[PDB]
Amino acid sequence: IYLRDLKVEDIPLARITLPDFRLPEIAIPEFIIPTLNLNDFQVPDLHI
Secondary structure (H helix, E strand, O other): OOOOOOHHHHOHHHOOOOOOOOOOOOOOOOOOOOOOOOOOOOOOOOOO
C-alpha cells in the first residue's frame, strides 16, 4: 500500500549494456616530388 521496491533495476530486463568507445586507425599517405632534371636540354655557354 506504499511505494514499490526499487531493486527491479537489478533484473536483466532493465539492463542497457551495449558496446561503445570506437577508435580510428592511423594510415598517412606518402608525399613525393619528381626527380626533375633540365640541364639535359640546355647548358649555358657564357661565362659569368
